[PDB]
């Protein structure tokens, strides 16, 4: 059941198609996951994992399709932030 934690999560809102090699295919119910204590993944130090409106690009991955890449914080909805583990 994975060898690591999940971290914080964001529930997709609408089906979005990608156009850049940076962006990936986004579907409904697609939950994305980040780091548990290394949101600095991007270089941030204050973004409030709860409000994507202030964050620009979020980089994460969707195990739903086992795909990964970047997505704007204007098509998902933050749901929960905590040290989630099996």
């Amino acid at each position: 059941g994975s060898m690591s934690a999940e971290g914080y999560q964001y529930r997709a809102l609408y089906d979005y198609k990608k156009e850049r090699e940076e962006d990936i295919d986004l579907h409904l119910g697609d939950i994305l996951t980040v780091n548990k204590g290394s949101l600095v993944a991007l270089g941030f130090s204050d973004g409030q994992e709860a409000k994507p409106e202030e964050i620009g690009w979020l980089n994460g991955y969707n195990e739903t399709t086992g795909e990964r890449g970047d997505f704007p914080g204007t098509y998902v909805e933050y749901i929960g932030r905590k040290k989630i583990s099996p």
Side-chain angles (χ1 to χ4, degrees):
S2 98
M3 303 232 184
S4 79
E6 289 172 36
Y8 334 126
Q9 273 165 59
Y10 297 77
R11 188 160 163 168
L13 212 81
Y14 238 75
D15 206 297
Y16 158 90
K17 254 65 130 56
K18 54 117 187 169
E19 198 223 296
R20 198 110 64 194
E21 49 150 54
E22 286 179 29
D23 284 27
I24 41 145
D25 286 299
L26 296 177
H27 348 320
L28 307 100
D30 269 53
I31 274 156
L32 280 66
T33 291
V34 210
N35 253 267
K36 67 197 180 193
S38 291
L39 104 74
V40 191
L42 286 161
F44 259 58
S45 264
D46 202 277
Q48 303 237 300
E49 345 192 311
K51 291 150 250 294
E53 42 163 64
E54 42 176 285
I55 316 183
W57 279 101
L58 300 98
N59 196 226
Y61 61 104
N62 343 59
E63 291 214 310
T64 293
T65 163
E67 215 74 70
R68 74 101 209 254
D70 302 81
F71 60 102
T74 194
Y75 280 113
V76 306
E77 219 190 305
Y78 161 78
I79 34 158
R81 96 297 259 188
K82 34 166 148 174
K83 41 158 267 179
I84 286 157
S85 244

